[PDB]
Design an enzyme around this catalytic site. Structure first.
Site, PDB file in Angstrom:
ATOM      1  CD  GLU A  71      -1.126   1.225   3.408  1.00  0.00           C
ATOM      2  OE1 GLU A  71      -0.748   1.286   4.601  1.00  0.00           O
ATOM      3  OE2 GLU A  71      -1.931   2.039   2.900  1.00  0.00           O
ATOM      4  CB  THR A 145       2.929  -6.406   3.600  1.00  0.00           C
ATOM      5  OG1 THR A 145       1.763  -5.988   2.927  1.00  0.00           O
ATOM      6  CG2 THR A 145       4.088  -6.062   2.732  1.00  0.00           C
ATOM      7  CG  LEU A 252      26.237  -9.226  12.331  1.00  0.00           C
ATOM      8  CD1 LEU A 252      25.992  -9.643  13.821  1.00  0.00           C
ATOM      9  CD2 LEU A 252      25.218  -8.229  11.869  1.00  0.00           C
ATOM     10  CD  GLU A 254      35.594 -11.807  13.654  1.00  0.00           C
ATOM     11  OE1 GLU A 254      35.927 -10.670  13.238  1.00  0.00           O
ATOM     12  OE2 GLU A 254      36.259 -12.472  14.486  1.00  0.00           O
TER      13      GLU A 254
HETATM   14  N1  LIG Z   1       7.572  -1.572  16.524  1.00  0.00           N
HETATM   15  C1  LIG Z   1       6.724  -1.361  15.515  1.00  0.00           C
HETATM   16  N2  LIG Z   1       5.741  -2.234  15.290  1.00  0.00           N
HETATM   17  C2  LIG Z   1       4.954  -1.890  14.250  1.00  0.00           C
HETATM   18  C3  LIG Z   1       5.043  -0.762  13.446  1.00  0.00           C
HETATM   19  N3  LIG Z   1       4.021  -0.755  12.509  1.00  0.00           N
HETATM   20  C4  LIG Z   1       3.356  -1.868  12.750  1.00  0.00           C
HETATM   21  N4  LIG Z   1       3.874  -2.604  13.791  1.00  0.00           N
HETATM   22  C5  LIG Z   1       3.411  -3.895  14.326  1.00  0.00           C
HETATM   23  O1  LIG Z   1       3.315  -4.809  13.253  1.00  0.00           O
HETATM   24  C6  LIG Z   1       2.096  -5.580  13.353  1.00  0.00           C
HETATM   25  C7  LIG Z   1       1.163  -5.229  12.221  1.00  0.00           C
HETATM   26  O2  LIG Z   1       1.920  -5.291  10.994  1.00  0.00           O
HETATM   27  P1  LIG Z   1       1.998  -4.068   9.937  1.00  0.00           P
HETATM   28  O3  LIG Z   1       3.459  -3.622   9.766  1.00  0.00           O
HETATM   29  O4  LIG Z   1       1.127  -2.890  10.122  1.00  0.00           O
HETATM   30  O5  LIG Z   1       1.584  -4.885   8.640  1.00  0.00           O
HETATM   31  P2  LIG Z   1       1.945  -4.825   7.089  1.00  0.00           P
HETATM   32  O6  LIG Z   1       3.247  -5.526   6.806  1.00  0.00           O
HETATM   33  O7  LIG Z   1       1.986  -3.428   6.593  1.00  0.00           O
HETATM   34  O8  LIG Z   1       0.729  -5.645   6.462  1.00  0.00           O
HETATM   35  P3  LIG Z   1      -0.620  -5.180   5.748  1.00  0.00           P
HETATM   36  O9  LIG Z   1      -0.778  -3.675   6.009  1.00  0.00           O
HETATM   37  O10 LIG Z   1      -1.683  -6.160   6.288  1.00  0.00           O
HETATM   38  O11 LIG Z   1      -0.410  -5.473   4.289  1.00  0.00           O
HETATM   39  C8  LIG Z   1       1.584  -5.328  14.762  1.00  0.00           C
HETATM   40  O12 LIG Z   1       2.222  -6.271  15.618  1.00  0.00           O
HETATM   41  C9  LIG Z   1       2.041  -3.889  15.018  1.00  0.00           C
HETATM   42  O13 LIG Z   1       2.129  -3.609  16.415  1.00  0.00           O
HETATM   43  C10 LIG Z   1       6.122   0.172  13.707  1.00  0.00           C
HETATM   44  O14 LIG Z   1       6.353   1.242  13.144  1.00  0.00           O
HETATM   45  N5  LIG Z   1       6.917  -0.232  14.763  1.00  0.00           N
HETATM   46 MG   LIG Z   2       0.224  -1.674   5.766  1.00  0.00          MG
END
Ligand SMILES: Nc1nc2c(ncn2[C@@H]2O[C@H](COP(=O)(O)OP(=O)(O)OP(=O)(O)O)[C@@H](O)[C@H]2O)c(=O)[nH]1
Ligand SMILES: [Mg+2]
Ligand SMILES: CC[C@H](C)[C@H](NC(=O)[C@@]1(C)CCCN1C)C(=O)N(C)[C@H](C[C@@H](OC(C)=O)c1nc(C(=O)N[C@@H](Cc2ccc(N)cc2)C[C@H](C)C(=O)O)cs1)C(C)C
Ligand SMILES: Nc1nc2c(ncn2[C@@H]2O[C@H](COP(=O)(O)OP(=O)(O)O)[C@@H](O)[C@H]2O)c(=O)[nH]1
Ligand SMILES: [Ca+2]
Ligand SMILES: [Mg+2]
Ligand SMILES: [Mg+2]
Lengths: 440, 426, 67
Positions: A71, A145, A252, A254
């Site tokens: 997206e 994703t 990294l 090692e």
């Molecule tokens: N630490 C951290 N976790 C994140 C972040 N964005 C999303 N998450 C975590 O990732 C999970 C959700 O995955 P997303 O990264 O939003 O998913 P995506 O890969 O974009 O997948 P779709 O949007 O479904 O296509 C949850 O566990 C969220 O708490 C970020 O910026 N930092």
């Molecule tokens: Mg997304």
């Protein structure tokens, strides 16, 4: 030589990449337009930062990075943001429709349409490397994703690059910041598929990072911004070995040699010290011994588990800043005589140490205090399997009633892929139990 | 990204018209179609429900359908009737006369293709269409039969898109119409198979909230529609404003629908309001789990929650919201299925609805919704055992077989909501 | 010794090749099982809908049968 390509998959992966790249620039003196006055070798050089940054004739230091999401909205912010001039448009890849927190959509349905475009751009970056070491893959376990597309990309990278190093920084799901109820399915599906295709994986429990921000940095309801700023620091500590040079600097690879006893046992526990606020750091400096001891404090771990109820298979200490061997040696000697670390009977009790003299930098407008010295410990503990068990229990509760499985089945998947993934997870949990048993 | 709105029948058009006024107000769009708002967040995701027309104008991506021009003429005459695309008013002259078979198989059938052409015109100009949302009644004939006929015809051309509906359920406390149970049972039989997600808007609930809770002497249809509009504004907040949780129809569906058939949600809202002239985070949190704030005449404590979505609107402490949401979940653990961990999802929007400083919308997939379907199957069996009023339907072409089939499918759906209400973790 | 040295580097190459091969095969197999499955799912869905259309003709014909 020894270039590394970074791949930022999904929102988690992209937003962490933003934080990481922002921080590397600050550490190397790279301006938001890609210019580095400190670098006299214009158009290119053999410098240690060149493992992560390519050089244009103009003098722009370009990250060896690809950002992928199914997206536009998250990557669009990178395109418009402060570092829009840092990246070439071709490094920022978006789809139109995301995977809707479904592994099957990111791996198959939606992901199949963008995979070859992603591979082409990785290939373009690969072609600019004089001696490619491998990849660093940033993604979440829970997103469609982050789980499915990473799986597919990993499988494809094994086919296209052979056994060239594939490392991951995987975001482990936590209720406090959890986006979907089906995160345990996506986590088990990606872990199974990717297991064979990864050489080392650093898991980051979002709950563990959440707690540190709340407890150490005194933040009420931590944001992804706060989280990513703390992850930026842990990632930087692990990659500093690659981006800087020094006499006491240990690579990294090692550390990896010591961290991976068996191919499936490639999940090291990351512990970072110090995580302190500017207020709490004013007139209080922490010594080499102080920061070292803080590594054996479960409160400072990237994953919530008890290594005191497990057994060590390795300990690596990655120091940053004003640190001399004399002090590191003494601090290690103390922890050893203090006999607080139980090791498996089959492996040497040594601590592998690296030191980079460049101190930890901080992003302006941060919560983190700038300290003189910092340490990141990478340990291989049987305790990391607790994370596997918690995720495996949640999966079990739902898959018993086949809750939400139709969403996966409707996208082309079979129940057989679920059971097979789960059996691999039971096998991995058993493998972690087996390595912890003393030899006869 | 884009959603296509379709309002069918009297009820559909009336509730659908109010939706457009309320969300337009929220997004800063006047009845002319221009933006005259303060915050940038109002526009960020405007492309979801509106078309960016030539000359910096915003047009509701809405299709107004009716087998009789009566209601649609009133909507055109209305305050916001001018914001619409004139070409999107597709109407018959005959009517359905509160006959499902008329809206479904005959009169509505003759009008359905003329609708499909506008649905397609709207869908072709979409950058990346999510799906569709239909506002209608199940007790009538047009929204009931034609609305369910439209659902299946659209699904044939866009099988991979989300089909969302706001289905207003028939009550005897609201209408004298005797064929309302027949029209509902045939509709629910369509909805079980062809919708992805249905918001169950029970008229019994809307009336009792008006009469008892809101202290309305004689509740009108527009009084009932103030509850419908409030509900509709809350359940679509996450789709219209920048957020992280349930930001699209499918992410919401993946989170709310554990089993394909069990996609009927119990909407809830707090504070309960009337269009007259007149709450803390713990109060808001407490209210949206009590039967009195349920848009469906079902008691949550008479069933178990499969999944829940909690939308919080206004400027409040996120920490407090997190703590209060944790409190209700721990203090009501028995009423939540154990075999679905972390089933309650919570979103926070800084933009409150108009007339409030803070509100809480609740979207629940509770097994207690079987109370709403049991009542309709009782209201059906009263007539069907007698074979009463069947000439209205057999005459239009139908069989007695279709009604037996429709009764069974809705009885099976209740057996299923019970099946998972009794399901054990160990 | 020179023979065994030759054998070892050859085994390294064959195991790497067999790995890339098996990976290629597993992926081709999975992307085809998924393509066939998703297609079969849409097919099933549209026949159910096409039979709802067939039934509607049977209803419109049953109405005209009385006149
Ligand atoms: N630490 C951290 N976790 C994140 C972040 N964005 C999303 N998450 C975590 O990732 C999970 C959700 O995955 P997303 O990264 O939003 O998913 P995506 O890969 O974009 O997948 P779709 O949007 O479904 O296509 C949850 O566990 C969220 O708490 C970020 O910026 N930092
Ligand atoms: Mg997304
Ligand atoms: C004696 C028959 C009356 C008409 C009827 N009675 C009943 O329902 C009962 C329960 C009485 C006993 C048997 N049973 C049939 C009734 O009260 N209703 C149908 C009302 C609805 C009725 O209100 C009153 C007070 O009678 C109506 N309200 C409107 C109305 O709101 N008009 C608004 C425009 C409108 C028109 C139609 C639609 N479908 C939606 C909106 C305009 C006005 C200004 C307003 O918004 O209040 C019209 S009829 C209730 C139950 C919802
Ligand atoms: N809450 C609500 N119910 C309505 C409204 N208009 C009609 N109804 C209900 O709709 C049912 C009859 O369906 P109706 O929409 O009028 O017929 P249609 O034109 O054939 O779709 C009855 O149960 C009415 O009480 C409305 O604006 N709001
Ligand atoms: Ca240079
Ligand atoms: Mg009517
Ligand atoms: Mg009526």
């Amino acid at each position: 030589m020894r270039e590394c390509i970074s791949i930022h998959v999904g929102q988690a992966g992209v937003q962490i990449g933003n934080a990481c790249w922002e921080l590397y620039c600050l550490e190397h003196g790279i301006q938001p337009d890609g210019q580095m006055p400190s670098d006299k070798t214009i158009g290119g050089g053999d410098d240690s930062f060149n493992t992560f940054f390519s050089e244009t004739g103009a003098g722009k230091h370009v990250p060896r990075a690809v950002f992928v999401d199914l997206e536009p909205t998250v990557i669009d912010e990178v395109r418009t943001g402060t570092y829009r001039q840092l990246f070439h448009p071709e490094q920022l890849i978006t789809g139109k429709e995301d995977a809707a927190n479904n592994y099957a959509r990111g791996h198959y349905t939606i992901g199949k349409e963008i995979i070859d475009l992603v591979l082409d751009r990785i290939r373009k970056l690969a072609d600019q490397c004089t001696g490619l070491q491998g990849f660093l893959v940033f993604h979440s376990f829970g997103g469609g994703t982050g789980s499915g597309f990473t799986s597919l990309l990993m499988e494809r990278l094994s086919v296209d690059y052979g056994k060239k190093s594939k490392l991951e920084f995987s975001i482990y799901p936590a209720p406090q910041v959890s986006t979907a109820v089906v995160e345990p399915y996506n986590s088990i599906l990606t872990t199974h598929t990717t297991l064979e295709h990864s050489d080392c994986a650093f898991m980051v429990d979002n709950e563990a990072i959440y707690d540190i921000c709340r407890r150490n940095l005194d933040i009420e309801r931590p944001t992804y911004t706060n989280l990513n700023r703390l992850i930026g620091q842990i990632v930087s500590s692990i990659t500093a070995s690659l981006r800087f040079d020094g006499a006491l600097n240990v690579d990294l690879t090692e550390f990896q040699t010591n961290l991976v006893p068996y191919p499936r046992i490639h999940f090291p526990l990351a512990t970072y010290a110090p995580v302190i606020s500017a207020e709490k750091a004013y007139h209080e400096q922490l010594s080499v011994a102080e920061i070292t001891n803080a590594c054996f404090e479960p409160a400072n771990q990237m994953v919530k588990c008890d290594p005191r109820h497990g057994k060590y298979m390795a300990c690596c200490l990655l120091y940053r800043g004003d640190v001399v061997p004399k002090d590191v040696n003494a601090a290690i000697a103390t922890i050893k005589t203090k006999r607080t670390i139980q090791f498996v009977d089959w492996c040497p009790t040594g601590f592998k140490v690296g030191i980079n003299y460049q101190p930890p930098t901080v992003v302006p407008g941060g919560d983190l205090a700038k300290v003189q010295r910092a340490v990141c410990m990478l340990s291989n503990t049987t305790a990391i399997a607790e994370a596997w068990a918690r995720l495996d229990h949640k999966f079990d509760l739902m898959y018993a009633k086949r809750a939400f499985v139709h969403w996966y089945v409707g996208e082309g998947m079979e129940e057989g892929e679920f059971s097979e993934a789960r059996e691999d997870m039971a096998a991995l949990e058993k493998d972690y139990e087996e390595v912890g048993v003393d030899s006869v | 990204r884009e959603i296509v709105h379709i309002q069918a029948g009297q009820c559909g058009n009336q509730i659908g018209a109010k939706f457009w006024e309320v969300i337009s107000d929220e997004h800063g769009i006047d009845p002319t179609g221009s933006y005259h708002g303060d915050s940038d967040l109002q526009l960020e995701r405007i492309n979801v429900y509106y078309n960016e027309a030539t000359g910096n104008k915003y047009v509701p991506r809405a299709i107004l359908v009716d087998l009789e021009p009566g209601t649609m003429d009133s909507v055109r005459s209305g305050p916001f009737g001018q914001i619409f695309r004139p070409d999107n008013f597709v109407f018959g002259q005959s009517g359905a006369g509160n006959n499902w078979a008329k809206g479904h198989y005959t009169e509505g059938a003759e009008l359905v293709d003329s609708v499909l052409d506008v649905v397609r015109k709207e869908s072709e100009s979409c950058d990346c269409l999510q799906g569709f949302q239909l506002t209608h009644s199940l007790g009538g004939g047009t929204g009931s039969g034609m609305g369910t006929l439209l659902i299946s015809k659209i699904r044939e051309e866009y099988p991979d898109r989300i089909m969302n509906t706001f289905s207003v359920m028939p009550s005897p406390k609201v209408s004298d119409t005797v064929v309302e149970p027949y029209n509902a049972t045939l509709s629910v039989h369509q909805l079980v198979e062809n919708t992805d997600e249905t918001y169950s808007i029970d008229n019994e609930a809307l009336y009792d909230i008006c009469f008892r809770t809101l202290k309305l002497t004689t509740p009108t249809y527009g009084d009932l529609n103030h509850l419908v509009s409030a509900t509709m504004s809350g359940v679509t907040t996450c789709l219209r404003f920048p957020g992280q949780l349930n930001a699209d129809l499918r992410k919401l569906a993946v989170n709310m629908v554990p089993f394909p058939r069990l996609h009927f949600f119990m909407p809830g809202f707090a504070p309960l309001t009337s269009r007259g002239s007149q709450l803390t985070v713990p109060e808001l949190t407490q209210q949206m789990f009590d039967s009195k704030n349920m848009m469906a005449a079902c008691d949550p404590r008479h069933g178990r929650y499969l999944t829940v979505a909690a939308v919080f609107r206004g400027r409040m402490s996120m920490k407090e919201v997190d703590e209060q949401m944790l409190n209700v979940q721990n203090k009501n653990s028995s009423y939540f299925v154990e075999w679905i961990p972390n089933n309650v999802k919570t979103a926070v929007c800084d933009i409150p609805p108009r007339g409030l400083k803070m509100s809480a919308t609740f979207i629940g997939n509770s097994t207690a919704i079987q109370e709403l379907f049991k009542r309709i199957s009782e209201q059906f069996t009263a007539m069907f055992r007698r074979k009463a009023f069947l000439h209205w339907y057999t005459g239009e072409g139908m069989d007695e077989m279709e009604f037996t089939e429709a009764e069974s499918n809705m009885n099976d759906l209740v057996s299923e909501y019970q099946q998972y209400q009794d399901a054990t973790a160990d | 010794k020179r023979e065994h040295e030759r054998e070892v580097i050859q085994k390294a190459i064959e195991e790497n090749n067999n790995f890339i091969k098996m990976a290629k095969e597993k992926l081709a197999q999975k992307m085809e099982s998924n393509k066939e499955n998703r297609e079969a799912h849409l097919a099933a869905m549209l026949e159910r809908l096409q039979e709802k259309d067939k039934h509607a003709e049977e209803v419109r014909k049953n109405k005209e049968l009385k006149e």
